């Protein structure tokens, strides 16, 4: 079923975008998490980063890199599930028989 | 690391036969070709 | 012309020649004679080089 | 003011000015153009020379003075010591 | 509340940076489209230097001729050099000034718009 | 207080300029899409080649530079404040360039196969270029350049780097 893979990949990309937004918002401490957009974002992103908070402590106890590590791990995981041939120029198999492909 | 992830990915009607003409029709439409 | 395309770009032999010897193909499940010369049938597959060039031209046109 | 001397730029400018002053002191000719350079290179009085020729005569006199100074003052002192085994590039 | 450095060393605001950014982008956009800036365009100068020099020379020569003397022409870049080799070297300054006519006046970017 | 707050000298300015040259190396690939228009900036295509060679001699050089600057320079409170501020500003500009690269990597194919991408590429250079130039204009001068959404975070991070494990 192509629809299943399509929907799964779309959901994974949306979750990756949410994690990237959380990483970006970690730079600003003035934002209030009680406001509707930030509250919804943190409600969505709480458990996945909460797992890594327990798994990985801060390096020196003063700086936090947990959202970045979660984003990188999820990026690698979703990269694992990319389509075999993404078309663009990939499905043309480059030019002729090639060392690369 | 690169090799481990590559091996896992390789571990997992063909593409060029049907998908090449399917994706082009679905995404890049033109009446001179698809009408 | 050929002199222009050779000038543009030929190939990058990082792993050596990218074109290899040809492999004849024979029909498995069923000719005007002319049995003097056996014609090459290596290109009858879809995964070959000629089909790749044709798909490249079709993609460029589309 | 020592405050001016404290800055690196002022020191560099003063060093450049001193080098220029020493060079002008040791290479600028006086009366040797007509005496030696002009007659030797053109065989004419400097006044009759074209403006671009007088500069050439002055440059020739200055170069002769520079070579004389570098031979009679620096090279004699540094060559009184003979060739001290003359280290050479090994590779 | 945060330190923000000593007050003796001058600080630049954010408004100046925003103005610089917007000004650069607007300059590029105005240069790209000559005819869209309220029906007008953006000009670097008012009068070309050659035009001003020609007008001034014309007026000066008229005044000198009317006064009863042979008019003189003032050259942009400088006068001649007393040399006896070649003609280009003798008039090098004026030729150097005149050889930059196209770059001095015309703009480097394309005058019209392509792809739109 | 014991923190040094004197003016920055020339070697720190040179170091900060060399540090600022990093995002230019990161985004130098898309200079042609901008240079095709307004050729007067064509020199910007040929200026970063030695820096491209030196910063890319090893795959993990940027992380080593970041760790050597954040801990070795920004943490120290005996270095003048302006030098640390400029080092952190350069690091943050590099981070912004990395963010731009990451958001480039996920462009849809529809935008990829349209001229819009070219425009995007041009902007990816131009904006970054402006920032660097601006910072450089306030790097050779021992002044503070303030940029929205960045400078306040840099000011906080400077004092968070201090009293680290103390
Ligand atoms: C065409 C040439 C090149 C330009 C130049 O010469 C003419 O201009 C000259 C003149 O401008 C000099 C400057 C004069 C002003 C000086 C200012 C001084 O600042 C020092 O510290 C304080 C300011 O921070 C006070 O000023 C103090 O009083 C001074 O000690 C600075 O340290 C050196 C200084 C800038 C000097 C540097 C060297 C110069 C620029 C000289 C420079 C070579
Ligand atoms: C030659 C140059 C100059 C010298 C220098 O660079 C090289 O040497 C470097 C090196 O010496 C660094 C020090 C190494 C030792 C570090 C010690 C560290 O103490 C920390 O104390 C915290 C206590 O909570 C940590 O615990 C945290 O929380 C969890 C508990 C840990 O787990 C987690 O990890 C962390 C953990 O117990 C320990 O990490 C301190 O916070 C920073 C520290 C002192 C570093 C400060 C900066 C340095 C001195 C650098 C210093 C600039
Ligand atoms: C008879 C004398 C004539 C000499 C004329 C000298 C012209 C030099 C004037 C100074 C110009 C400054 C550029 C020097 C930067 C060195 C970088 C370098 O070499 O890159 C050399 C590169 C060229 O790079 C070369 O390009 C080649 C192209 O085929 C190849 O790729 C080579 O591999 C590559 O090395 O050029 C540049 O990147 C030029 C950058 C210019 C940046 C603008 C400067 C902005 C500030 C200007 C302010 C004025 C500066 C003072 C000017 C007055 C000076 C008296
Ligand atoms: C324009 C784009 C928008 C501006 C974006 C500016 C870059 C944002 C940086 C994204 C966060 C980077 C990161 O992982 O920070 C993760 C954390 C963010 O650290 C936070 O920084 C804030 C800045 O004021 C405050 O200091 C917070 O206390 C601190 O938690 O960074 C580190 O732990 C140290 C900095 C490493 C760089
Ligand atoms: C030219 C390179 C010499 C630079 C260091 C000499 C100057 C010197 O050592 O002065 C010491 C230098 C600055 O010290 P102060 O500010 O006290 O010195 C001001 C006066 O000493 C000026 O002479 O401190 C450093 O270690 C900064 C240099 C970091 C390293 C700079 C690297 C430059 C980039 C790499 C090239
Ligand atoms: C229906 C509603 C659709 C309307 C969408 C409106 C969007 C307008 C955005 C601007 C379009 C301008 C139109 C415009 O400027 O060019 C847009 C154009 C991109 O091509 P497009 O696909 O937009 O247009 C090609 C057309 O054939 C199809 O639209 O740029 C290029 O060709 C390369 C330009 C590089 C230029 C580099 C320098 C750029 C300097 C200016 C930076 C401007 C941004 C400043 C930000 C402060
Ligand atoms: C990429 C755009 C980010 C915008 C969200 C951050 C805005 C912070 C405003 C803080 C006001 C106190
Ligand atoms: C400002 C640097 C140069 C100043 C000194 C000039 C040296 C030549 C003087 C000749 C006098 C006869
Ligand atoms: C920095 C923003 C880049 C563009 C993000 C939006 C992409 C445009 C298409 C969205 C709807 C398909
Ligand atoms: C409708 C297609 C997308 C329009 C906007 C694409 C270009 C955005 C440039 C932003 C650069 C940071």
TrEMBL record, chain A:
GO cellular component term, pick one: membrane
Modification Phosphothreonine, positions: 98-100
GO biological process terms on file: chloroplast fission
Protein name: Fanciful K+ uptake-b family transporter
Naturally occurring in which organism (per UniProt): Chlamydomonas reinhardtii
Shown chain mapped onto the complete sequence: 79 to 179 of 187
From TrEMBL, chain D:
Domain of life according to the entry: Eukaryota
Name of the protein this chain belongs to: Uncharacterized protein
Organism, scientific name: Chlamydomonas reinhardtii (Chlamydomonas smithii)
Residues of the full protein shown: 9 to 99 of 124
Automatic annotation (TrEMBL), chain E:
Taxonomic superkingdom: Eukaryota
Protein name listed in UniProt: Uncharacterized protein
Organism: Chlamydomonas reinhardtii
UniProtKB/TrEMBL annotation, chain F:
Protein keywords: Chloroplast, Membrane, Plastid, Plastid inner membrane, Transmembrane, Transmembrane helix
Transmembrane segments: 54-73, 85-103, 123-145
BP GO annotations: protein import into chloroplast stroma
GO MF annotations, alphabetized: protein transmembrane transporter activity
Localization: Plastid, Chloroplast inner membrane; Plastid, Chloroplast membrane
Gene Ontology CC: one annotated term: chloroplast inner membrane
Record membrane topology: Multi-pass membrane protein
Protein family per UniProt: Belongs to the Tic20 family.
Primary role: Involved in protein precursor import into chloroplasts.
Name of protein: Protein TIC 20
Organism: Chlamydomonas reinhardtii (Chlamydomonas smithii)
Origin organism lineage: Eukaryota, Viridiplantae, Chlorophyta, core chlorophytes, Chlorophyceae
Residues of the full protein shown: 94 to 259 of 259
